[PDB]
Amino acid sequence: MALVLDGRALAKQIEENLLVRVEALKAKTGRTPILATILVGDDGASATYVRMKGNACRRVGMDSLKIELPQETTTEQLLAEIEKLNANPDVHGILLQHPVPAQIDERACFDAISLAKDVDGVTCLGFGRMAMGEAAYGSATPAGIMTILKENNIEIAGKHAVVVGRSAILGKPMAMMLLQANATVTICHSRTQNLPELVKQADIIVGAVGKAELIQKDWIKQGAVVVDAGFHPRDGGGVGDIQLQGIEEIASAYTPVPGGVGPMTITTLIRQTVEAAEKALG
Amino acid sequence: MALVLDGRALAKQIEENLLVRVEALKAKTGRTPILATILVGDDGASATYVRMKGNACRRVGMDSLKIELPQETTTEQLLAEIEKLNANPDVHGILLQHPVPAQIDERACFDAISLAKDVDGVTCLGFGRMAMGEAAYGSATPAGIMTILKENNIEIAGKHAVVVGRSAILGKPMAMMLLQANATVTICHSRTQNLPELVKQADIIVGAVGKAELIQKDWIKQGAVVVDAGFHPRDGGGVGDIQLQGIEEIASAYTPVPGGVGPMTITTLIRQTVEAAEKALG
Ligand SMILES: Nc1nc(N)c(NC(=O)Nc2ccc(C(=O)N[C@@H](CCC(=O)O)C(=O)O)cc2)c(=O)[nH]1
Ligand SMILES: Nc1nc(N)c(NC(=O)Nc2ccc(C(=O)N[C@@H](CCC(=O)O)C(=O)O)cc2)c(=O)[nH]1
Ligand SMILES: [Cl-]
Numbered sequence: 001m002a003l004v005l006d007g008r009a010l011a012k013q014i015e016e017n018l019l020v021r022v023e024a025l026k027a028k029t030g031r032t033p034i035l036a037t038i039l040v041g042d043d044g045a046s047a048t049y050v051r052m053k054g055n056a057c058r059r060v061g062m063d064s065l066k067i068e069l070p071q072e073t074t075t076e077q078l079l080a081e082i083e084k085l086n087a088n089p090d091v092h093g094i095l096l097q098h099p100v101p102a103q104i105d106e107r108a109c110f111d112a113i114s115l116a117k118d119v120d121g122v123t124c125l126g127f128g129r130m131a132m133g134e135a136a137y138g139s140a141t142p143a144g145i146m147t148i149l150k151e152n153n154i155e156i157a158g159k160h161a162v163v164v165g166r167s168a169i170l171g172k173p174m175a176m177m178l179l180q181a182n183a184t185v186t187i188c189h190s191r192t193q194n195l196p197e198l199v200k201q202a203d204i205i206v207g208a209v210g211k212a213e214l215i216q217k218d219w220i221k222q223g224a225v226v227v228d229a230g231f232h233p234r235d236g237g238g239v240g241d242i243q244l245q246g247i248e249e250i251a252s253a254y255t256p257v258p259g260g261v262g263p264m265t266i267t268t269l270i271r272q273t274v275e276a277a278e279k280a281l282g
Numbered sequence: 283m284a285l286v287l288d289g290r291a292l293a294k295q296i297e298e299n300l301l302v303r304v305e306a307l308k309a310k311t312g313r314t315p316i317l318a319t320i321l322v323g324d325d326g327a328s329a330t331y332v333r334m335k336g337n338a339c340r341r342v343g344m345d346s347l348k349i350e351l352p353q354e355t356t357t358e359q360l361l362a363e364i365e366k367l368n369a370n371p372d373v374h375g376i377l378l379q380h381p382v383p384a385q386i387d388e389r390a391c392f393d394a395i396s397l398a399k400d401v402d403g404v405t406c407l408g409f410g411r412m413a414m415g416e417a418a419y420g421s422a423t424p425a426g427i428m429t430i431l432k433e434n435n436i437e438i439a440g441k442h443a444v445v446v447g448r449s450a451i452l453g454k455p456m457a458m459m460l461l462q463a464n465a466t467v468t469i470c471h472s473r474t475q476n477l478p479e480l481v482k483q484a485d486i487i488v489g490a491v492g493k494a495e496l497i498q499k500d501w502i503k504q505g506a507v508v509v510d511a512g513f514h515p516r517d518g519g520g521v522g523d524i525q526l527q528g529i530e531e532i533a534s535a536y537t538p539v540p541g542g543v544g545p546m547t548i549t550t551l552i553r554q555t556v557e558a559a560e561k562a563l564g
Pocket of ligand 2: 331334377378379380381402404422423451513520539540541542543544545547548
């Protein structure tokens with residue numbers, strides 16, 4: 001039966017020393033690390049995830065600066081708001097929760113965040129530096145996945161990884177991180193013409209499509225490592241981007257949904273905020 | 283027989299347009315566009331390609347500022363030279379010819395070049411922006427390849443492109459550019475297993491390994507589009523990274539070596555320098 005890649009347990013374990021580090025920094029400097037979170041508009045899921053990230057901050061002795069902007073916020077207004085936070089020495093990391101209202105140029109706003117405070121890893125600069133092996137905060141969800149794979153001793157070098165999805169904050173960074181770990185990487189998307197065929201070749205499959213159980217269980221290679229980065233609420237248990245019912249007979253290891261990639265998205269953001277604060281204050 | 287993707291003809295065609303644009307610019311402003319070329323050490327191929335790039339500048343009515351630094355140059359010394367060029371308003375583009383002597387942090391020096399003068403497309407920032415669909419000068423060789431494919435009406439969207447090699451200035455940007463053009467993209471490298479099988483699945487193959495004829499002709503899918511980005515001087519005619527002997531029987535279209543990717547590497551650099559000059563002097 002497949003090894004459950006327990007993101008919930010890993011997140012809990014990691015938070016233990018993050019709390020020690022933060023309490024050390026606060027005792028040393030007399031200053032509390034701050035993650036500024038920006039929630040723009042009325043997306044309920046975005047609201048929920050921002051609160052979860054704030055809670056996680058407080059669990060390790062940090063706090064959040066809660067920035068909430070209306071649905072009709074313009075690109076110019078959000079940029080100004082990010083420039084305030086960039087020049088705020090009391091703020092050590094900046095999160096802009098995706099997806100912002102459609103009228104806003106999200107890419108422009110991501111890129112306005114200073115590299116030093118890009119603790120969610122959304123800037124083009126952060127991405128390019130990561131892709132080229134230079135030190136950078138990685139996009140939270142894919143960096144969290146690499147941590148899951150590494151802590152669970154999952155072999156990556158020489159494996160064929162297939163990433164289904166190519167979004168700026170998930171699929172693309174995921175692909176580059178796996179490449180950096182010496183996987184052969186295939187990147188698929190909505191214009192891939194033979195998706196089932198390619199998924200069946202995957203030693204490591206990452207579902208990053210944001211569509212409930214799009215990736216069929218029948219496409220999964222026997223002994224594959226299965227990573228499901230999706231989450232879709234449903235009556236009595238949500239589902240991810242991959243059909244996981246009966247995956248225990250197929251995968252060598254898999255991320256459950258919930259309790260897999262999700263907690264480690266949050267933990268990665270928090271860890272990288274701790275890192276930023278240490279650099280800023282220490 | 284296969285379509286010859288004639289990079290030499292395309293380069294000449296592009297240069298005719300660049301010439302009239304440069305002459306118009308000089309007529310309007312009285313100033314000549316300048317590419318600063320930085321050659322560090324005594325590598326023969328590097329000297330040759332920098333000479334060819336300077337020749338191309340003058341063919342289209344521009345000139346080059348030839349910077350030649352010794353073998354023992356330090357990272358700090360090279361950074362200082364690049365910062366002088368960044369601050370010089372008469373210099374519109376900066377080329378650092380790779381590979382610099384190994385004691386130099388080449389990545390750090392690439393990244394010191396201002397985005398506005400990154401006409402060879404070597405910055406992390408430029409790579410990141412291109413990968414995310416934002417405006418930036420593209421790495422010369424892979425951008426030249428995209429142009430070859432486009433201007434020969436080669437179908438890319440929905441095709442499986444396999445890039446063999448993942449270098450910072452070739453393989454990685456090549457893959458991100460093909461992905462932006464809606465190809466399914468597989469990135470291979472020295473740790474890749476079952477390489478012959480992965481190449482056989484490819485609708486578009488890009489050889490970027492810097493090893494003479496590594497990619498074997500029987501690995502190529504019948505009807506594939508074959509792009510060879512290698513060059514290795516040999517008595518009686520140089521060869522690339524792909525066995526191209528009898529390629530006309532196998533490929534639907536192929537870049538010859540020499541006279542394919544090479545000329546378009548040079549012309550892409552010059553075109554992007556003209557663009558930089560047009561912006562700066564307008
Ligand atoms: N900037 C930015 N925007 C984004 N939209 C994200 N994604 C971004 O927050 N995703 C996310 C998804 C699931 C969970 C999570 O922990 N989910 C729980 C399920 C609980 C629930 O969703 O009610 C789980 O999977 O265990 C946390 C974050 C991000 O990481 N950064
Ligand atoms: N920064 C930087 N460093 C680099 N090292 C390169 N590569 C970088 O100049 N390559 C290159 C390779 C071949 C040719 C070329 O035109 N080759 C001819 C052959 C010339 C001959 O036969 O002597 C051809 O393929 O037709 C031009 C540039 C680059 O583009 N940028
Ligand atoms: Cl809590």
